[PDB]
Amino acid sequence: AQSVPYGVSQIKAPALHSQGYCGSNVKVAVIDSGIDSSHPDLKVAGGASMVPSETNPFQDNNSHGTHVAGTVAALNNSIGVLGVAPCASLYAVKVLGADGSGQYSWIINGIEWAIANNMDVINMSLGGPSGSAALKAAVDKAVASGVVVVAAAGNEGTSGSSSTVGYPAKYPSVIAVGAVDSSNQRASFSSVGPELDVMAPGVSIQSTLPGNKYGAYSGTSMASPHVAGAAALILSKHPNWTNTQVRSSLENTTTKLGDSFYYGKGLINVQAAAQ
């Protein structure tokens, strides 16, 4: 039987599904460790590998990319779980190796790939403590080209009064996503700062794993795909909205939580955001 992970319901995705909005024809790129295309609960449309020693983007030796991808778009059927945008066209852009590490050049190449291939939405469940002119240039170009760019804020918790948001989330053009639990409380690991935009479920998130498995992961990496997926639903309802409109709608219709330094605008609500 199919289970709906708490997080999907928490963001109010199912209300849209009921309406016939499931992200059809929206191209979402998961820029991560690849996606196991053999998983029965996933449909991968395409992709690319930027990792020189791992040329198949459809082999995920890490497991994270498959897990993020399931949050975005696990199929609606009689097995496994359910994605936020179960009809989205899913792309594996492999930029991390089996060890879950990657060079910046690989990440940037993958963003460039996404722009060139007309992705509507980019999900980056990755982060580093430092940026670069090239990393900023790529995200900025994607946004100027009409792409919704979503990133995990980072898992650095608090640091006195400083921003612990990593890059690329830290850049203004990117939506930065922090993590809450099922009670709407901020996860202790969730990065903080003025650059935090929105919150999404990121604790004990059930999703797909390689080899026809399912399991729970925690992190802002798990929170981000809920927003990427939410962007895909909105785009399925309002195909002519610009990335700017999608972003503003998500940020403006949140359920407000605590201070913006810790929760940004609050918890997304796709039902409200979809109008």
Tell me whether residue 97 or residue 210 sits nearer to Ca ion (CB atom): 210
Residue 120 near Ca ion by CB under 5 A: no
Cβ atoms of 47 and 58 within 8 Å: the answer is yes
93, 115, 174, 209: which one binds Ca ion (CB under 5 A): 174
CA distance 125 to 177: 9
CA distance 30 to 91: 6
Residue 156 near Ca ion by CB under 5 A: no
Judge whether 36 counts as a catalytic residue. no
At its nearest, how many Å lie between Ca ion and the CB of residue 187? 19
Count of Cβ atoms closer than 10 Å to residue 212 Cβ: 13
Tell me whether residue 94 or residue 247 sits nearer to Ca ion (CB atom): 247
Peptide bond into 168 cis (omega under 30): yes
Phi, psi of 23 (to 5 degrees): 85, 20
Tell me whether residue 87 or residue 174 sits nearer to Ca ion (CB atom): 174
Residues 6+ away with beta carbon under 8 Å from 200: 7, 11, 177, 178, 179, 180, 223, 224, 226, 227, 230, 267, 268
Judge whether 221 counts as a catalytic residue. yes
CA distance 58 to 6: 27
Q: Under rule CB under 5 A, how many of the chain's residues touch Ca ion?
A: 9
Tell me whether residue 41 or residue 120 sits nearer to Ca ion (CB atom): 41
Catalytic residue among 17, 64, 67, 226: 64
Residue numbers 36-75 binding Ca ion by CB under 5 A: 41, 74-75
Tell me whether residue 79 or residue 116 sits nearer to Ca ion (CB atom): 79
Q: Which region, judged by CB under 5 A, interacts with Ca ion, from 54-62, 78-86, 217-225, 240-248?
A: 78-86
At its nearest, how many Å lie between Ca ion and the CB of residue 176? 4
Residue type, 84: V
Q: H or E stretch including 221?
A: helix 220-237
At its nearest, how many Å lie between Ca ion and the CB of residue 169? 5
Question: Helix, strand, or coil here: 272?
Answer: helix
> How would you classify the pairing of strands 89-94 and 44-49?
parallel
At its nearest, how many Å lie between Ca ion and the CB of residue 80? 4
Judge whether 32 counts as a catalytic residue. yes
Residue 212 near Ca ion by CB under 5 A: no
Residue numbers 1-30 binding Ca ion by CB under 5 A: 2
At its nearest, how many Å lie between Ca ion and the CB of residue 72? 13
What residues are annotated to the active site? 32, 64, 221
Chain contacts with Ca ion (rule: CB under 5 A): 2, 41, 74-75, 77, 80, 174, 176, 195
